[PDB]
Amino acid sequence: PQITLWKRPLVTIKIGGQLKEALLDTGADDTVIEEMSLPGRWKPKMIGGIGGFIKVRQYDQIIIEICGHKAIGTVLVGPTPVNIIGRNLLTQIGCTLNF
Amino acid sequence: PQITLWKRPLVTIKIGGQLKEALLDTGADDTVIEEMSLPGRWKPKMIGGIGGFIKVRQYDQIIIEICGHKAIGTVLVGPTPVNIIGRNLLTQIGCTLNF
């Protein structure tokens, strides 16, 4: 779909059998989700944003279905104010900016 | 232009007579720039991101030319890692997401 930006670009996702809403975020290099119990192995990681940084758990090769388009990639999980779909997954669903 | 997301969506801006590069950021409600000496009145403001928050100066009705398209709006100025063009200005240049 084509999405205008008068409101936040929130979409429904399904990940790890759970339904969530997440922001399509072209400023984010990586995907960062609120605390959830993704199964399997991981690696602690530090990421920085406006405000400073947070500690996250890095999960690789995780399936996410982002507005009905499947993608597999790294998902960081941690103390975020908002679930963020970053460019690592946006590129897999074919997302572009246009003006 | 149409912009893919394999790299950061950086564009050239001109603001306050100065040339800068900024990120087209659909996840940001507001526009936040690194410290610069925008002339005129303003109001101190707190904004939150990943990591916590920062204090900024809020400047209204500031002209910015974002990849050649003019826009006027609020610009927050403060201690950001990266210059961010948020939706307040993206909507003025007609920016959409597409997949």
Ligand SMILES: CC(C)[C@H](N)C(=O)N[C@@H](Cc1ccccc1)C[C@H](O)[C@H](Cc1ccccc1)NC(=O)OCc1cncs1
């Ligand atoms: C993987 C990313 C999440 C990454 N850690 C991250 O925060 N990138 C941001 C750019 C950046 C990079 C390094 C250091 C500082 C800032 C851009 C994201 O697009 C972020 C998304 C966002 C996160 C939290 C709350 C609101 C937006 N944008 C954002 O800070 O615009 C600024 C705001 C405007 N109003 C409230 S904050």
